[PDB]
Structure 1
Amino acid sequence: MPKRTDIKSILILGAGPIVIGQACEFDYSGAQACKALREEGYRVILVNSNPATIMTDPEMADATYIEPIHWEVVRKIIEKERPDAVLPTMGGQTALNCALELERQGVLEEFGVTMIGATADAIDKAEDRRRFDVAMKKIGLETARSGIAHTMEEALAVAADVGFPCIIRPSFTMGGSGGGIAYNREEFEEICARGLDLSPTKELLIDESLIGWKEYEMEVVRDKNDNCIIVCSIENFDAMGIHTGDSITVAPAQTLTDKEYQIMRNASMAVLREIGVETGGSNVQFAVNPKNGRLIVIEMNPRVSRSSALASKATGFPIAKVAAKLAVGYTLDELMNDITGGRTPASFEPSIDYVVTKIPRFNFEKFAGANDRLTTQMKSVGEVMAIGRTQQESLQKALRGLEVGATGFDPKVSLDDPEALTKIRRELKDAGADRIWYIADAFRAGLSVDGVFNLTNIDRWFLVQIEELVRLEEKVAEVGITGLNADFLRQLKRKGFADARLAKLAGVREAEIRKLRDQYDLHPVYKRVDTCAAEFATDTAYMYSTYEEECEANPSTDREKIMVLGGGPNRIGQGIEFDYCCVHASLALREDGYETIMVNCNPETVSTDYDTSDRLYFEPVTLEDVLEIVRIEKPKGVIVQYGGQTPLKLARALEAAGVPVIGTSPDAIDRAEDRERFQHAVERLKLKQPANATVTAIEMAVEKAKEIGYPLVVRAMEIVYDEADLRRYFQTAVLLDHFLDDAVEVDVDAICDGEMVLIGGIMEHIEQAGVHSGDSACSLPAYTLSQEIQDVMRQQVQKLAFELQVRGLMNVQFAVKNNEVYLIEVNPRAARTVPFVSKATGVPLAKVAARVMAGKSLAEQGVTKEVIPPYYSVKEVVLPFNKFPGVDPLLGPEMRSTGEVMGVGRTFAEAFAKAQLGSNSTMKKHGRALLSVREGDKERVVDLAAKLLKQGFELDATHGTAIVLGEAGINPRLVNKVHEGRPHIQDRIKNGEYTYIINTTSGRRAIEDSRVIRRSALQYKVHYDTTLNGGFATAMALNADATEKVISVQEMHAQIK
């Protein structure tokens, strides 16, 4: 019952790099599991390739491994650390799968490592779809009609029995990875092939469609004494057929009677018991036929999840924390409920006096040719959460915290468009990421609730509320600001209406609506999350805004407050990296004695965990929301630089409205951000910048272009090669810039206190300029750049720090061409590389800079010298192309990566190898390599082929490339391009002839025609490089062994002079 004496140490398996379907939720959880076991006197060991995690912070565990999440690598960690046990439930699918490999491979036996939390058998019973379904039969629960398939022939037989549309779900995957809905044999085939090969057990479960039934989820927790609680119930707004991760969802369940709810609850418990989870959490999913309440079990996830994280945030009950303790012997009765100050046990079922709404965040615009319809395979990249006293309020708040520019139900379609109803109809019937908005528009257009129900399958309980908000909006447009009397305004505010939305409808500035509320004494009150619906007092300040009577904010008078603005939902280019920064600002300043206040609404991160700050306002990061909090807190300062774009874009307005923004001023930021302003600064300082112009018309371009010279960077960024190439753009299609061809891109992170400049880290990217820094692998220290060249950069950054008056963090991007340093851009705020630099350099840049912003000089901190670690640190990214097959998996000036990994080695090659393997690369040290490069790479490709031949690779080459090789004495086996004959490249890729592919291209046309090589390599899991630099890096890594040695972060850090 109490803690376990047989277990002294514990290995916790991290989730790895951020990917669609497996995100920030795992850092929140992993961090919680570390925290919980460390509080209990346990030795904490963990592995996480993702450096941008709070869970990999050195002080969070005893032995922290930022190494590739590979069984062989872990094995080396086991060996070395000798863990008594291993906890595999805190790191998504990656941890479950790793744990089972290690089992399978006998590593657990070898080292007497005990599996805690969930057993290998429990895990399999849940993950093996065949096994799960049999399990249901055993406990008398119902599942839809389905069939297993291990082959395509097996699969069609199943498709024939269940009929179309059918749902496909691979075993051993989650987030809908590898699955989908098939409407015809064609889509059946494509999805089945993808699922078959992506499944770790090569099996698919194919089911009859329950499309449109209601979708529910329950978060369950169980202890060794068999005590069992339901932590949260969740009702999906989007019906069965749209993955829960890509659906709008609410807590608690809303349309089930108590009798149904108990059936569901009981089933949930039976599932856990049957599967075999006795010491921890699990999520159970169901489908309910709205017509007769028929309950169908769908699946269960034997670990923490994106729902468990949302559940924790929603209820205030910290699932992961509790589950960790429970894996070491604790029981629920013995654990205390955190937010009720421990006066109540953890053995209870939370009760919420409010409505929690989650809305997925998408990035379809980044992947233009991708199918943008929502399905069973997740496609969202982040999520927003909001709390309201009513569903309406909860929903609009969430819409306004989405960071999509919405202020609520903003219209997508105009009322005077004759085909408006057709577009609306299509959007409702076959949902895209904008459905929510189309729903309101249908009501604006006269469609009835029933009409909408019929098309969407969205419960009328929700539909009616949206319809009501529309009618209210109609009224505001009619009465104007004049009709906005105190009573009506209050009513609208209580429904969630944003001032901006009201201003728009009424035809006034939002500021005028805001002023109007003050007039009427209409400000929101803040209520607290307490897990028990106010039954018990709380000593925690976890709040949400609402238009009610009593306020529970009760802001201290006693202290000095610093507010930290988060970035809202994650999106591409706006990741966990900013959240790490935010967290760091709060942890540092609090430790420093300041009272910290976090403003954020992302349910997946550590920033929204109540232990992270003194006060947490779980709110939309908007001007309105923030202003109301400042109004009552009167903090000393507000940090706007750490949360990414979101807060950044509010700085000027905040300052204008009287907010004490500390650190680099909003004008300074804008000075940098401003193309005009900037180009001036660069000259003033006499720094080099690419040739640029600002054209309005085409023909002004051609000219100006002729003048700047091609290639040109057209700021949806493209690189136009020639004149003919520009119209091409122009048409299909303003900043014009000279593209720096064959240039080395560099990222420099620094701190400026007005007194000095601290160089955080100089990072040399592997991919050249033209490949977004966010998608580039990079090295620290620089692996090819000269001390001399770097000293130049160093000085150039210092010059810019002072000039812009940076106070805190800054990032500067350079390009080195022909031993000459050019300025790409200055980002006077925290950049996404910070956590990487912090980890490589052991210096907590976000903490230092926070202090600096708050008033402690660098001098004052004892942070004056630049740190060059003894080892090499390499960062590599993970790209979501596999989630959008129709997209060309090719690098470019636009960022598309979701996450990152870190590799540490004694040599760049070792570090690069570790980065590569951690990024899930399928590269091998044998086989055949395919070389198909462009002109500009032909010469340089010779050396690359030499290398590969030297590593034992055989070579294949496309015509032109073979020509040049041949001319240098290397004779690759020639391969035909698809138009050339058979077999061609695609047949070879498909047929497994290659273990490695190097394919570089240039030109819109060229790219377009070579697409098959890249799509093919991706589809068939062949490691590929789209840049010669990447090639060379990969070639070097071949001489390294990523499994040879391991090192802890602590060890890394101690090794520093």
Structure 2
Amino acid sequence: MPKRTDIKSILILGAGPIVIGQACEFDYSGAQACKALREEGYRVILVNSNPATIMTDPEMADATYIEPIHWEVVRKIIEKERPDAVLPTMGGQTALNCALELERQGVLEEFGVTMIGATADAIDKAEDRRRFDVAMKKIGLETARSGIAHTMEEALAVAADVGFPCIIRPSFTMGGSGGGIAYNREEFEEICARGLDLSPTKELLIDESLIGWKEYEMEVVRDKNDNCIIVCSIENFDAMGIHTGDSITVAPAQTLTDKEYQIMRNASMAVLREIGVETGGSNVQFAVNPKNGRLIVIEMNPRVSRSSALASKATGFPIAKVAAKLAVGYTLDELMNDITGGRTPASFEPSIDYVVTKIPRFNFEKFAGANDRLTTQMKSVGEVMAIGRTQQESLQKALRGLEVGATGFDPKVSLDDPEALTKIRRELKDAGADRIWYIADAFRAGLSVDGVFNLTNIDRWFLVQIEELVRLEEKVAEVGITGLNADFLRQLKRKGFADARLAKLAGVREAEIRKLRDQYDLHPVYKRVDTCAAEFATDTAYMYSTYEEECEANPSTDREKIMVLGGGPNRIGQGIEFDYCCVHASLALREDGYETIMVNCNPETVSTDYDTSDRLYFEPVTLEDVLEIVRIEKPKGVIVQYGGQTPLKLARALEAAGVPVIGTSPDAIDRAEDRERFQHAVERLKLKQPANATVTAIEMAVEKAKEIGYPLVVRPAMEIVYDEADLRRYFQTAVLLDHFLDDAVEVDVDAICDGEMVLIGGIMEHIEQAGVHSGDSACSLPAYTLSQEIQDVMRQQVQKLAFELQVRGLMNVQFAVKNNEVYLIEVNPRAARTVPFVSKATGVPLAKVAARVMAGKSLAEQGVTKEVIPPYYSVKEVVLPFNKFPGVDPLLGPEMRSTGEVMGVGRTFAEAFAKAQLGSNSTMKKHGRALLSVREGDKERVVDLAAKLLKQGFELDATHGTAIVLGEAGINPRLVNKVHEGRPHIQDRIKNGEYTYIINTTSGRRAIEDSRVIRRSALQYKVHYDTTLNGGFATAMALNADATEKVISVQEMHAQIK
């Protein structure tokens, strides 16, 4: 059967703000679905609180709702758009959970909404761990010995049975959320408490250990005719015990005989059949004992996933698109295979002629007190992917594409370190993020493949390859540049060695190796992705580099080309925002008639979807890889301002190599990026900036400091020193020096300069004061407290800066307003993370406009010359990953730690903030008891916040000093003991659920370290808390609004724009 006709309109549940374990893969999927269903003629309605997604672009769907993803809110959308059906398998766990809640709530029944893709029962079958387990035994599939628990007591008993260490896995969670490995009782209780609370169904599955077994995944697609295919198989590099998401993985599987692979392939199909996924894809995970091939089923995810994205990129088979279609009645045999020119059907199993490698990206450096060992709970914040003709080539390209500074197997320990083997050993035996490099160190240190195996459980098949690469490195080091003949170099290149890695080994510059390649005429060739191992031709240009004979690039001589450089893997601070920009640059220029070439290696993104551009090079974004592309494409221009820091840093070297960089110059970029260069410009501009000073020595610092005045913003990390004694203190632990603008409003300004004029894209006033990173601050567009007069001043300074710095395309300027004076914090001469939010809030596609400007079309020529001020408020709020690393003090500061964000649209500020707060998953309540514990400097404004809470119906508790201050003003909160004061104290009160809200502000290293328990408990016990007075006020205002009262679509919002 073909498409469904008893369905016209479809609601798609988006995933929400990016968080660890639930990332960009969902925008890629959501967008695929939107696209697919749209092409089929369905009316598409979708909801996604995350503004930095292509799927929320108004032109991608019929009714776009950027609203909090809460069933009450979604009901309003339903009741409001009356969709015939709902597709809940394209939005991660958030979508599955929402779907089931809407279901639970009768909401679906209420409005006659048919669930497509997967049924509620199907979902539950796979999501309820108990149900899943029963299902496997029923199909004769083996599962680990285990037990279900709904309380601690139950938990403990299962443990008593399975023993330690044991695996804890909550029902209705993913990415390992709420789970872990308990090696002891202590760890056991903690993890258990954590998951029971997190589990949407207050249920856990506790299993015996299979740690060290091989880990495998299979991506399956099934149609209503019962047609079923394996789209891809994945073999994990890291063994069972380390979440797939935090593991190095490869495609296709490598160490299974055909016989074992069929058994697994058969099991995978059986599982979908038993679970009930009839129209869609699913991921099925397994454990295999390398010693005997014994197969164990671990889980199944009834939806698209992070693996399905990897899998789609790996094979060229667009899983989510296909799935959306299947959800509407189509069958596989009916759809055509995209990449094969539609020549073949979608009913086939891909075969690939290369090896795909994925490597997770971590950010442990941003979470000091965190446990940095890899486990079953994901901790990674992104991932890179690489394609190579061989595993070695594949692995190495991925290493250089990771954006961690590696050039491949850079050494971590010194050969002369007497303790080296001992350090290596620990790293191996207890994996952390750097395990991979340590594996190579182990080989340099004298450990054997068997020795490494024993500690890591990583299959020898991979280990021997790494070892062989080390040995190759030793030869390079030995023969030096002199030994780098053509044959040898070719050989090294074929194995994935980067010119940079070889340069370090031969003690020369990277450019020297490159040059040598040029001399030898040693350049890579390009192969295309085709889903079929070259069995059929392709009309698509999805390519990867390798060192081989035949090149499949066949670049055009026809079109003028524009290259867009991506940001590689996502990391904190370098999210999807930058990719949204790359995507818009591509869509716009292509629409404009240019031939668009994308350079990126993030498997989770829309930028790496072949549909997004004319040509896609799935390569590491490095000087070496880019120059090779350029070398053969010879583009008209290259865009380096859209991908974040990654391409930004290659700017100079690219130009230096004669690359045609468009938009703001590499020099210009540096003028803004170099503090000094920047200080002059400001100076020349007669602009205000905090007093500063580079201090070399300690004492030079204590004196300079006196000059600057306290407090101080010590940027070498980031810290705020309050006093002389603090200075030395820091120094002890520990250089630019800057007066910290205390009690200031932080403001961000996005703008475009075409050399003729400057367009203000948006003035966003932060809720949190200067001192809390902008990436972690909630913000409002338009400003909610800044005078027009002062904004006008900021507008003029932006212009002054724009023209002086020679900006051409996007720029972002950051200020601090203190005492009616504008101060400059910084200029980011490129696309900033606020660009999507502003575009959404204002209806103007800034990245599309700035990209045209960069390409040559003025703002005047485009008809985009006036700043837009929406008739409603747009509030952006963020989501922080502290819940993933409970050992970290969950407080805000000068360094960014957030992973994502949501947007709230309201008639008023209070209304927008409320929707933003809710969208961010705040557990804020409208009643209860609030705990106030503020710093000296806040003691004064607290009174008012306290009055506000009072008028709302809250009761109040407070600590000593704060109570003292309230009493004096006429407010008598109930006194609470500080942990050291006695009992009960706040921790007890928090642990015992007494509060529904906490406001705790602090100041000073010592005071912070001391108050750490408040924040930590608050987060643990799920109590809403603010760590800024400014945030408290805002929260207070929203108390007056109702986020579920009214909803608006993006199209409506943009229509209201006059």
Q: CA deviation at 1:65?
A: 0.1
Measure, in 1, the Cα distance between the counterparts of 2:368 and 2:835.
Answer: 30
> Deviation string for 1:776-804 (max 9, x for gaps)?
00000000000000000000000000000
Q: Tell me the alpha carbon deviations over residues 761-790 of structure 1, each in whole angstroms, 9 at most, x when there is no partner.
A: 000000000000000000000000000000
Mapped to 1, the partners of 2:152 and 2:588 lie a distance apart of 56
Q: What whole-Å deviation, never above 9, does each CA across 1:286-315 have from its counterpart, x for those lacking one?
A: 000000000000000000000000000000
Q: Within 2, Cα distance between the matches of 1:834 and 1:425?
A: 45
> Which residue pairs with 2:919 in the alignment?
918
1:423 and 1:573 map into 2 onto residues whose CA distance is: 31
Q: Quote the offset at 1:710 in angstroms.
A: 0.3
| Alignment partner, residue 724 of structure 1 | 725
Q: Is 1:491 matched up with 2:497?
A: no
Matched ranges for 1:157-236 at <5 A = 157-236=157-236
> CA separation in 1, counterparts of 2:185 and 2:571?
34
Matches within 5 A, 1:29-44: 29-44=29-44
Cα distance in structure 1, aligned partners of 2:327 and 2:1002: 52
Instruction: Name 1:862's counterpart in structure 2.
Output: 863
SS for the counterpart of 1:296 is strand
- 1:597 and 1:855 mapped to 2: Cα distance? 17
Deviations 1:37-86 (A, max 9, x none): 00000000000000000000000000000000000000000001000000
Give the C-alpha shift of residue 458 in structure 1.
Answer: 0.2
SS in 2 for 1:1041: coil
Q: Distance in 2 between matches of 1:878 and 1:975?
A: 29
| 1:868, distance to aligned residue in structure 2 (A) | 0.1
Deviation at 1:683, TM superposition (A): 1.1
TM-score for the superposition, normalised by structure 2: 1.00
Write out aligned runs for 1:616-1015 (5 A): 616-715=616-715, 716-1015=717-1016
Q: Distance in 2 between matches of 1:387 and 1:854?
A: 31
State how far apart, in whole Å, the 2-side matches of 1:22 and 1:343 are: 35
**SS of equivalent residue, structure 1 residue 387:** strand
**Displacement of 1:615 after TM fit?**
0.2
CA deviation string 1:871-897 (max 9, x = no partner): 000000000000000000000000000
Deviation at 1:1014, TM superposition (A): 0.1
Q: d(CA) in 1 for partners of 2:978 and 2:154? A: 34
Deviation at 1:563, TM superposition (A): 0.0
C-alpha distance in 2 between matches for 1:481 and 1:737: 46
Aligned to 2:271: 271
Task: Report the Cα distance in structure 2 between the residues aligned to 1:13 and 1:406, rounded to whole angstroms.
Answer: 38
Distance in 1, Cα, partners of 2:935 & 2:373: 35
Q: Distance in 2 between matches of 1:1001 and 1:371?
A: 25
Cα offsets for 1:325-380 (capped at 9, x unmatched)? 00000000000000000000000000000000000000000000000000000000
Partner Cα distance (1:986, 1:938) in 2: 22
For residues 610 and 47 of structure 2, the distance between their equivalents in structure 1, rounded to whole angstroms, comes to 25
Per the TM alignment, residue 738 of structure 1 is displaced from its structure 2 partner at its CA by 0.1
Taking the aligned partners of 2:931 and 2:161, their CA distance within structure 1 comes to 43
Distance 2:971 2:163 in 1: 55
Secondary structure of the residue aligned to 1:909 is helix
State how far apart, in whole Å, the 2-side matches of 1:349 and 1:384 are.
Answer: 24
> What are the Cα deviations for residues 798-827 of structure 1, in whole angstroms up to 9, with x where unaligned?
000000000000000000000100000000
Separation in 2 of the partners of 1:696 and 1:305?
A: 50
Distance (Å, rounded) in 1 between the aligned partners of 2:479 and 2:685: 55
Q: Could you tell me the percent identity over the aligned residues? A: 100
Q: Hey, what's the Cα distance between the residues in 2 that align with 1:507 and 1:691? A: 42
Cα offset for 1:521?
Answer: 1.1
Shift of 1:4: 0.3
C-alpha distance in structure 2 between counterparts of 1:3 and 1:298, whole Å = 34
Q: Deviations over 1:710-742 (max 9, x none)?
A: 000000100000000011110101010000000
**Corresponding position: 1:154 with 2:180:** no
Cα deviation code 1:589-616 (max 9, x no counterpart): 0000000000000000000000000000
d(CA) in 2 for partners of 1:1026 and 1:507?
Answer: 50
Q: Paired residue for 1:86?
A: 86
Q: CA deviation at 1:272?
A: 0.1
SS in structure 1 opposite 2:690?
Answer: coil
CA distance, structure 2, for counterparts of residue 22 and residue 938 of structure 1:
39
State the alpha-carbon separation in 2 of the partners of residues 690 and 395 from structure 1. 46
Residue aligned with 2:384, SS:
strand
CA distance in 2, matches of 1:1044, 1:612: 37
Distance in 1 of aligned mates of 2:229 and 2:495: 33
Map Cα deviations across residues 562-593 of structure 1 (whole Å, 9 max, x no partner): 00000000000000000000000000000000
How many positions carry a matched residue from both structures? 1057
- Partner Cα distance (1:520, 1:668) in 2: 36
- How far, CA to CA, are the matches of 1:184 and 1:138 in structure 2? 32
Quote the Cα distance in structure 2 between the aligned partners of 1:14 and 1:1009: 40
Write the distance in 2 (CA, Å) between the matches of 1:253 and 1:720: 53
1:259 Cα deviation after fit: 0.3
**CA shift for structure 1 position 663:** 0.4
Q: What is the Cα deviation at residue 126 of structure 1?
A: 0.3
The SS at the match of 1:300 is strand
* Deviation readout 1:112-141 (Å, 9 max, x if unpaired): 000000000000000000000000011000
Looking at structure 1, the residues matched to 136 and 64 of structure 2 have their Cα atoms a distance apart, in angstroms, of: 39
Shift of residue 899, structure 1, vs aligned partner: 0.0
Which deviations, in whole Å up to 9, do the C-alpha atoms of 1:415-472 show, x marking residues without a partner? 1000000000000000000000000000001100000000000000000000000000
Aligned to 1:52, the other structure's residue is in SS state coil
1: CA distance, partners of 2:186 / 2:994: 26
* CA-to-aligned-CA distance 1:931-986 (integer Å, 9 cap, x gap): 00000000100000000000100000001001110001111011000101111000
- The Cα offsets for residues 847-885 of structure 1, whole Å up to 9 and x where unpaired, read as 000000000000000000000000000000000000000
Q: Write the deviation string for residues 250-308 of structure 1: whole angstroms up to 9, x where unpaired.
A: 00000000000000000000000000000000000000000000000000000000000
1: distance between equivalents of 2:828 and 2:144?
Answer: 53
Secondary structure of the residue aligned to 1:677 is helix
Deviations along 1:170-214, whole A, 9 cap, x unmatched? Answer: 000000000000001010011001011010000110000000000
Match of 2:168, SS? strand
Aligned partner of residue 229 in structure 1, secondary structure:
strand
Q: What secondary structure does 2:433 align onto? A: coil
Distance 1:469 1:979 in 2: 57
How far off is 1:519 after superposition?
1.0
User: Quick check: 901-910 or 675-684, which moved more?
Assistant: 675-684
Structure 2 CA distance for aligned equivalents of residues 485 and 711 of structure 1: 59
Equivalent-residue separation in structure 2 for 1:728 and 1:131 (angstroms): 56
Correspondence 1:91-102 to 2 at 5 A: 91-102=91-102
**What secondary structure sits across from 2:383 in the alignment?**
strand
Following superposition, the deviation at residue 518 of structure 1 comes to 1.1
How far, CA to CA, are the matches of 1:828 and 1:679 in structure 2?
A: 15
Provide structure 1 residue ranges, at least 5 long, that are not aligned to the other structure: none
1:40 and 1:647 mapped to 2: Cα distance? 37
Measure, in 2, the Cα distance between the counterparts of 1:261 and 1:727. 62
Q: 1:195 & 1:696 partners in 2: Cα distance?
A: 49
What is the CA-CA distance between 1:707 and the residue it aligns to?
0.6
Indicate the residue corresponding to 1:600 in structure 2: 600
Distance 1:550 1:180 in 2: 48
CA–CA distance in 2 between the matches of 1:819 and 1:289? 68
Which SS does the other structure have where 1:101 is aligned? helix
Aligned partner of residue 607 in structure 1, secondary structure: coil
Residues 489-536 of structure 1 show CA distances to partners (whole Å, capped at 9, x for unaligned) of: 000000000000000001111101001011111100000000000000
Answering whether residue 312 of structure 2 is matched by residue 312 of structure 1, we say yes
